[PDB]
Design a protein around this ligand. Structure first.
Ligand SMILES: [K+]
Ligand SMILES: [K+]
Ligand SMILES: [Mg+2]
Ligand SMILES: [Mg+2]
Ligand code: NA
Ligand code: NA
Ligand code: NA
Lengths: 141, 88, 198, 129, 85
RNA sequence: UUGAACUGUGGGCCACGUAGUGUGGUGCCGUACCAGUCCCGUACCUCGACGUGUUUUGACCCACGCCCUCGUGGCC
RNA sequence: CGCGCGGCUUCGAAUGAA
RNA sequence: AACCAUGACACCCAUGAAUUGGGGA
C-alpha cells in the first residue's frame, strides 16, 4: 500500500536476468562515462541522465556497462547535487503548495495534502542525517 | 506390515481401512458416497479376458465435482487411456 | 630467446613443453594476425594445465592468465581459442583468470568487511562465465531429490546450440576439476518464458 | 508487512495440503526455509522440491504426497532446554509416537529426536505431523 | 486436455498471457530498434517506449512521439528490431 | 513494540554390503509391433529388424578407514 | 575534408535491486 | 443509527456473467 494514502498500485520496472551487454552495442565503457559527464554538466538529475541514454543511445542499465551506478560516477568526479534528489523534489513541491495557499485560504484540501508532504520530508531528512548524507543539525525550515 | 504392532509380533489393529488412490486419504466407514469401479482387461482380440482393474475414489471428491478429473489421471497411469493421438 | 616474454618471468627458468609451445604460437600469432597484433603484447600467460579422461576422447588444455588482463582478452577471445585449436590438434582451448578466495570468518564484525569479489560464490560464477564466454547463462536451478542429493542445472541459449554443443561434455569436466563442483547443462529456446528445448 | 518468511512458507504448505493440491509455489524463501524443508523431506513427508533462481530471493516448487497433516511455525522462538523437550511435545503434538518439533541449535537446524541424542537445546522453530 | 501441468515448467499458452512480474521469473517487456529516417544516411537506436524526446543526429528532426505505452514513429521512418542479447 | 534476502556446511580412494534413478550395451524368448509375400475389401495368410524383461555398466544415497597445501596456486 | 607514419615533450572493481 | 453497527498492515484461497480507468495484440 502507499505510505500516505489509499492507493494500491503495482506499476514498476522488471529488470532482465541477463546482465551482460547485448554485443551489438559498440560504445565502449569510456564513451559512456564521457556522455554521463557531459549531460550532468547541463544540470540534468541522475534520473534524467538514465532516461536520455536509454531513449537515444542504446544504453540500458548503465551499471551493466562500466560497472558503476550513475550517482557513484558523479560523486567521484565531484559533480553530485548538494542534497539528494528525492528530498529536493519533495521540498520544491511543498514550496509551490505554500505559495498557492497564501492567496487561497479556504483550500482546506490542499492544507490536508501539505501536511502529508511535510510529514514525508521530516521522515526522509531523519534518514539522511543518520547515514550522514546531510550535515547534522540540518533543518527543513 | 500394516497397522500397529505390539512389542511381540501380534497385529492389534482391527479393520485396516482403504486409502484412496487419488488423495491418499483414509476412507472411513460412515462415508456413503465412496465408490469402487471395475474395468475389464481384454486380449489382443476384442473379447474380454476375465481380469478387472479396480479404482477407489474418496467420496468428498465426488461432491466437489473433481471425481471425473481424478479418474482420467488414474486410468492414464494404469495404462488404459491413450493420452494423445498418434502421429500420422 | 624472446618467446618466453609471453610466459611469466618466474616460469622462464624451467618452462614446460606445453608452456613453451603456447608461448611460441602466441609470438608468431603476434605478428601474423591483423587484429591480434594489437592488444596482444601487453598480454602474458601464467601457466598451463592439461586434463584427460578415458571418456571424452578429446583433450582439454587450461590456460590461466593474470586477472589484470581480463578486459584485454575478452576483446580477443573466440578468435584466440580458435587459432590455438588450429595449431594444436586433438585439444580444445580454454582461457581462465586466476582468483583468490577468502574463507568465511566466524565473527560478525569481520564478516561485514570481507570483499565481495573474493567470496567463493562470486568467484565460481565468474569461472563459469569464463568457460563459455561468447554465450551466457539464462537460467539456473537447484534440485533436491528425495535422498540427500543436490543437482545444479545451467541453461544456455538455443540460438547457439550448433556452435557450442560439441564442447559441453568436456567443459563440465573442466568446471568440476577447478572448483570440485558438478554442473549439468540444458538449453532454452525463448528464455523469457522458461521454455526448455528438448 | 511481511514479518516472518518462515511463518509464511509453512502457512502456504499447510494450506495447499488442506485443499488437496499436488504442488505449491513459495516465495520469497531463504536459508532457514530450505533447511526446514530438508528435515521434512529426509523423514519422508513432502517429496522432491526444487529452487528456481532469479537474481533476488528465489522461489520454491514443492511436490506433495498426501502424508502431511499440518505444519506451522512457533512465534516467538521460545527457548528450550534438553530437559524441556517433553513439555513441548505434550502441548503441540497429537501423540508422542509420531511428529516432530524442529529446533535451531548451535550445531544446526534439526528435529528434537536428533537434538536429544546429541544432548543439546535451543530455540524452537516449528513442528509437523 | 489429458496433459498434466506442473509449475516448474509451464506451457507456452499459459505463460504468454501472464503479466510481467507475475511470470516464474520476471523480465522486461521492451526492446530496441534501429530507425532510419528518410535520407540522412544515419542509423539511430531508439527505445520502444521512449518517453523522452528523440532527434536524429544529422537532420535534427524528431523521430518518435511520446505516448502512454509504446512510442509511435513518424510516418516516413521504418524500424528494425534488434536481438535481445 | 515488530521488522525482507545475501558472504557457507567439502573432494578422492577405501573395500564390500546396500542402494534408486537413468545409462549403455547383452540375450532378446512369448506377444505385440515394423518392413516384406499371397491377397482381400473397395479380411487375412506367409517372411525378415523395432519395443518388453533376464542379465549385466554410470552416477546418488546409506553402512566407512585413511588422506587431502580440505578452491586455486606456489612448493615437493 | 579524412588518413597512418617519425621524433617525440607534456600530463574500473562495486553483493542484488524485495 | 459520524454504520459496513465489521481497527490498520501482510500471505493463501473455486467458479460464471457484467462494469469504471490505463496498457498490449
Ligand atoms: K496508508
Ligand atoms: K475510474
Ligand atoms: Mg532478517
Ligand atoms: Mg526496490
Ligand atoms: Na502509517
Ligand atoms: Na448504516
Ligand atoms: Na461505534
Amino acid at each position: 500500500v502507499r505510505m500516505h494514502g489509499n492507493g494500491h498500485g503495482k506499476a514498476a520496472s522488471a529488470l532482465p536476468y541477463r546482465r551482460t551487454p547485448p554485443t551489438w552495442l559498440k560504445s565502449s565503457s569510456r564513451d559512456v562515462i564521457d556522455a554521463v559527464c557531459k549531460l550532468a554538466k547541463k544540470g540534468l538529475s541522475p534520473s534524467r541522465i538514465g532516461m536520455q541514454l536509454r531513449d537515444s543511445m542504446g544504453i540500458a542499465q548503465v551499471k551493466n556497462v562500466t560497472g558503476r551506478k550513475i550517482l557513484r560516477i558523479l560523486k567521484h568526479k565531484g559533480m553530485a547535487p548538494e542534497i539528494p534528489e528525492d528530498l529536493y523534489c519533495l521540498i520544491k513541491r511543498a514550496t509551490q503548495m505554500r505559495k498557492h495557499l497564501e492567496r487561497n485560504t479556504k483550500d482546506k484540501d490542499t492544507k490536508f495534502r501539505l501536511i502529508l508532504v511535510e510529514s514525508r520530508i521530516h521522515r526522509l531528512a531523519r534518514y539522511y542525517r543518520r547515514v550522514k548524507q546531510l550535515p547534522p543539525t540540518w533543518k527543513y525550515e | 506390515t500394516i497397522g500397529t504392532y505390539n512389542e511381540e509380533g501380534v497385529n492389534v489393529d482391527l479393520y485396516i481401512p482403504r486409502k484412496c488412490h487419488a488423495t491418499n486419504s483414509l476412507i472411513t466407514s460412515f462415508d456413503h458416497s465412496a465408490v469402487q469401479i471395475a474395468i475389464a482387461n481384454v486380449d489382443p482380440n476384442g473379447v474380454i479376458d476375465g481380469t478387472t482393474t479396480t479404482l477407489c475414489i474418496a467420496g468428498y471428491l465426488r461432491c466437489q465435482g473433481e471425481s471425473d478429473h481424478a479418474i482420467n489421471h488414474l486410468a492414464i497411469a494404469k495404462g488404459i487411456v491413450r493420452i494423445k493421438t498418434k502421429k500420422k | 630467446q624472446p618467446h618466453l616474454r609471453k610466459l611469466r618471468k618466474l616460469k622462464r627458468a624451467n618452462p614446460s613443453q606445453e608452456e613453451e609451445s603456447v608461448a611460441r604460437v602466441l609470438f608468431e600469432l603476434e605478428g601474423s594476425h591483423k587484429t591480434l597484433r594489437a592488444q596482444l603484447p601487453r598480454f602474458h600467460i601464467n601457466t598451463v594445465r592439461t586434463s584427460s579422461s578415458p571418456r571424452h576422447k578429446k583433450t582439454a588444455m587450461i590456460i590461466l592468465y593474470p586477472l589484470r588482463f581480463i578486459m584485454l582478452v575478452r576483446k580477443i577471445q573466440r578468435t584466440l581459442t580458435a587459432e590455438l585449436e588450429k595449431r594444436f590438434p586433438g585439444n580444445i582451448v580454454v582461457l581462465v583468470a586466476q582468483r583468490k578466495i577468502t574463507k568465511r570468518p566466524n565473527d560478525v564484525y569481520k564478516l561485514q568487511q570481507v570483499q565481495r569479489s573474493r567470496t567463493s560464490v562470486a568467484v565460481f560464477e565468474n569461472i563459469l562465465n569464463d568457460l563459455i564466454y561468447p554465450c551466457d547463462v539464462v537460467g539456473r536451478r537447484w534440485r533436491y531429490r528425495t535422498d540427500g542429493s543436490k543437482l545444479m542445472k545451467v541453461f544456455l541459449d538455443a540460438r547457439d546450440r550448433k556452435r557450442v554443443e560439441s564442447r559441453l561434455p568436456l567443459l563440465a569436466h573442466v568446471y568440476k576439476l577447478l572448483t570440485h563442483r558438478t554442473v549439468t547443462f540444458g538449453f532454452m529456446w525463448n528464455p523469457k518464458l522458461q521454455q526448455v528445448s528438448s | 508487512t511481511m514479518m516472518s518468511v518462515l511463518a509464511n512458507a509453512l502457512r502456504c504448505i499447510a494450506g495447499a495440503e488442506r485443499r488437496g493440491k499436488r504442488q505449491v509455489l513459495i516465495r520469497p524463501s531463504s536459508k532457514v526455509v530450505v533447511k526446514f524443508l530438508q528435515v521434512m523431506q529426509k523423514h519422508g513427508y513432502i517429496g522432491e522440491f526444487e529452487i528456481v533462481d532469479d537474481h533476488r530471493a528465489g522461489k520454491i516448487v514443492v511436490n506433495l504426497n498426501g502424508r502431511l497433516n499440518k505444519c506451522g511455525a512457533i512465534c516467538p522462538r521460545f527457548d528450550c532446554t534438553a530437559r524441556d523437550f517433553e513439555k513441548w511435545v505434550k502441548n503441540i503434538l497429537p501423540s508422542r509416537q509420531f511428529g516432530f518439533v524442529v529446533l535451531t541449535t548451535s550445531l544446526g537446524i534439526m528435529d528434537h529426536e536428533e537434538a536429544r541424542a546429541r544432548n543439546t537445546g535451543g530455540k524452537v522453530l516449528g513442528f509437523f505431523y | 486436455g489429458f496433459f498434466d501441468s506442473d509449475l516448474s515448467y509451464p506451457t507456452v499458452r499459459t505463460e504468454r498471457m501472464k503479466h510481467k512480474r507475475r511470470r516464474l521469473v520476471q523480465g522486461p517487456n521492451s526492446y530496441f530498434m534501429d530507425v532510419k529516417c528518410p535520407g540522412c544516411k544515419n542509423i539511430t537506436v531508439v527505445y520502444s517506449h521512449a518517453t523522452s524526446e528523440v532527434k536524429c543526429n544529422g537532420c535534427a528532426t524528431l523521430l518518435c512521439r511520446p505516448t502512454g505505452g509504446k512510442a509511435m514513429l513518424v510516418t516516413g521512418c521504418g524500424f528494425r528490431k534488434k536481438p535481445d542479447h
